[PDB]
Nucleic acid binder design. Structure first.
Lengths: 93, 96, 80, 103, 103, 93, 80, 96
DNA sequence: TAATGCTTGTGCCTTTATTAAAGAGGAAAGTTGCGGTGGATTAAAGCACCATCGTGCGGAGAATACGATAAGGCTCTTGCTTCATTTGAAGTTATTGACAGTTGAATCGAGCCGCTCAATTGGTCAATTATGGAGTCAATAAAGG
DNA sequence: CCTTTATTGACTCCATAATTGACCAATTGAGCGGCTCGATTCAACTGTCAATAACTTCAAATGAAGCAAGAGCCTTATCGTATTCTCCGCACGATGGTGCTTTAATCCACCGCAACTTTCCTCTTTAATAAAGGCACAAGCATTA
């Protein structure tokens, strides 16, 4: 069966950041595992937030709060800014 | 008059405070410190009494555990006096 | 509010060390302990205020503190 | 048929992230589209940060490919990424550091 | 109407545990009755263990009520319970212990 | 609104173990919090096990595996024995 | 199988300490390290075998080891 | 002939092994040890090769971190030689 | 040894405050019945996992000479403990005023569910480019002089 | 400072293996519609949080005297280190046998949904008894002699 991964999108991001630098297969697998871990942490935090506030729907507010709780400091600030920009662009389209 | 040799009264307080379960830090200064720290994250914050009580319990438990680790580190260095280097080593090994 | 960290008096730190089994205490230990306590409170209060802000509240409850402590692996019993 | 990733200006898949969030929801939970957009945005931002640091580390060593060693160097050289990524990187080694007293 | 707890010979509520497990399931999950019986059995067993140790600690102090101090004594006095219960007990204090080198 | 707890069942267990010994309100709340934490850990482990094996149904096997993973050593052994006994009694009745 | 803990030779422990920045190594450090490694492997392998037995399998997969490591706060990247 | 003073070759290997990413323990002895340990939990267990590779990577990473903490403890006690007491102290502070 | 100040363990009355016992009623568990999804069963293919064989060389085991590190002891001096006095601020109690948390109803914004199309993503194959191996040279450091 | 020697980076070239780019399928995301439900808004109101004032008395601040613990230094002896030699078993390559894992089809079994009842658990209330306070006492301890 087909195993879904993030390799294509990680490669697109790498080409955006470093057009002439490639990535090995081991490093790509490590990056995929890291992305999976971050997504799992965000999903767990969002589910906990939804349970605490008795709100069954997970929205961008839950994701923002989970990012603030999980990511540290300036990294969390920049991630929140990027997410807000992406949501605004998505809604404006 | 009468004087106790150094280290005897200290041992008496070690025995006394280990048997008790009370809070060691005064409530009002800790509450003021908590409000001072919290005002950096959000202005015009209010605190429930139970929130400050839980914060004090957790803070004192953490400090007691850290002092136990600090005493372990001090005994490791063949000393009875705890030093800031002992706290730094304990926190470094703990991952803090 | 300012200089409230000095409200954690030297006798209080000595009592905390006595409960921890410490027999002798250095002079700089009080300032070191104040700094460490300030860092710990900063972390816990930051998480608690995040939880409070998510709930659209201005009052920090004991539940927010308990959740913040649980997030950092410092679970507390006796407050819910 | 316009993809939601292109609408949000992202490279990560908004639809796949939404599907994963839906499968991770508990007891009749619901996931909004903006939640998936937000999640994809943070995932792409973290990927870009890690890949930029790893590419800089690779360039410092005069190579044109990213390896687990470069990922380890990039992650352990950044305080925020070191705090966030506590996992073990296979084939990453350790950052070269010798204490002063041992010299 | 005979309760499931009495059918399983338990004191903890099998029905409430089943409802909590159902509300805690993810993405169209299903919970069997035997799962709820098992969960209630382990919960009641752990409660009985902790309460027995706490009652012994209370009896050693010649008191007829259990307090957080007794729970702390019982948990820290048992290696398995000390490993399992890592949380902080409010009003529990510490176990009286002084190192040999400080005497 | 009514807040559901485990106090009544903890009291029944205490009366079974120590008939003449009572429990304070603070100690009872601590016991309730401890039981809630254990139940949360067991539920999380069971959900993870169900996700790993692509099995949407949580049965006594998942709970047994979660008990073996979470509880330490002899405590886990005795808890598994008690759970098995309870399940056998439930099925035979 | 017996005396397989001795297969972790003294040169291997010395190399591991060298990678860790250790300049001088005592003579009992080798036995201490063997005991510590045995304890760590016992924990990880116990969790991995529990995961394998849940899946009704006889072969321990890399996924079981990864999950066992993640359970103990020792997450490993590079094997899925 | 030619001899290096003690501590020079040791520093050379500290520099060499920190720059590398290879595995330090031999594969076959580690596999045999893993099988011997696992046979105590379930009789007739088979091991996928990637499982043993992951076990070796995790074990060596843990050992390297523990040796770093042990070196910190040894330096704290004003020594350059690591001792079993240093490992015990580091593991106690880590909560192991 | 030993007296003697001294702190802590120990006994008895208070009382009080903290727990045990009861009532309504409402919230939820049990019962019955049914539909449909999911877990147990069975068979088959393939590959991966283990056991065997040869070899051969790199790494491990062991011994040697030895230097330098760790431990022990002695000194001294300064930093921390213990005690006593004054004070100033935390704790208690009584009061109050308003802010904010919580609950309840309407409702509109939005996410789930079905089904189809089709465009993106994944597995496989050929190769070309970056990486490592092998070998020699030069720059760097180390150790005795 | 010097000189000789061991170590390692660097430079070169060649093998090679590991990544990149192209092609078919298959799979799931997007589109569109319908529908229900849940998140937002509004408002009332009550719970409690913050601010105030007065009193008290207990713990904190400070200083004096002094002791003993930590740090520095000197010595020694033993124990880890660097080097050399022998050998041995790990790693690589090739092979075969099989068992066990994964997938696919079937079927039954058991769990979710719905509505009703009934009964069990959970605030509210009132009594009661166990324990902390307060006060006095006894004794194990510490301290100097």
């Amino acid at each position: 069966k087909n195993v879904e991964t993030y390799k294509i999108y990680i490669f697109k991001v790498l080409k955006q950041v470093h057009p002439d630098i490639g990535i090995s297969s081991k490093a790509m697998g490590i990056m995929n595992s890291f992305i999976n871990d971050i997504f799992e942490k965000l999903a767990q935090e969002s589910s906990k937030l939804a349970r605490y506030n008795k709100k069954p729907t997970i929205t961008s507010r839950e994701i923002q709060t989970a990012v603030r709780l999980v990511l540290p400091g300036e990294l969390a600030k920049h991630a929140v800014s990027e997410g807000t920009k992406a949501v605004t662009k998505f809604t404006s389209s | 008059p009468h004087r106790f040799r150094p280290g005897t009264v200290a041992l008496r307080e070690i025995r006394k405070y280990q048997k008790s379960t009370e809070l060691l830090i005064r409530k009002l200064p800790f509450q003021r410190l908590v409000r001072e720290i919290a005002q950096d994250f959000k202005t015009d914050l209010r605190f429930q009494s139970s929130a400050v009580a839980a914060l004090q319990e957790a803070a004192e438990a953490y400090l007691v555990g850290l002092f136990e680790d600090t005493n372990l580190c001090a005994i490791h260095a063949k000393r009875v006096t705890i030093m800031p280097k002992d706290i730094q080593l304990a926190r470094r090994i703990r991952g803090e | 509010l300012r200089d409230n960290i000095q409200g954690i008096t030297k006798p209080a730190i000595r009592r905390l060390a006595r409960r921890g089994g410490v027999k002798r205490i250095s002079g700089l230990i009080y300032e070191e302990t104040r700094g460490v306590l300030k860092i710990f409170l900063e972390n816990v209060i930051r998480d608690a205020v995040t939880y409070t802000e998510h709930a659209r509240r201005k009052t920090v409850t004991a539940m927010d503190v308990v959740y913040a402590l649980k997030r950092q692996g410092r679970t507390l019993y006796g407050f819910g | 048929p316009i993809t939601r990733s292109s609408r949000a200006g992202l490279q990560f898949p908004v639809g796949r992230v939404h599907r994963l969030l839906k499968t991770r929801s508990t007891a009749h939970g619901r996931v909004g589209a903006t939640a998936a957009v937000y999640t994809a945005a943070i995932l792409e931002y973290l990927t870009a940060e890690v890949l930029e640091l790893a590419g800089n580390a690779s360039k410092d060593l005069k190579v044109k490919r990213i390896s687990p060693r470069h990922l380890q160097l990039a992650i352990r050289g950044d305080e925020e990424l070191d705090t966030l990524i506590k996992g073990t990187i296979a084939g990453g080694g350790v950052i070269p550091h010798i204490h002063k007293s041992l010299i």
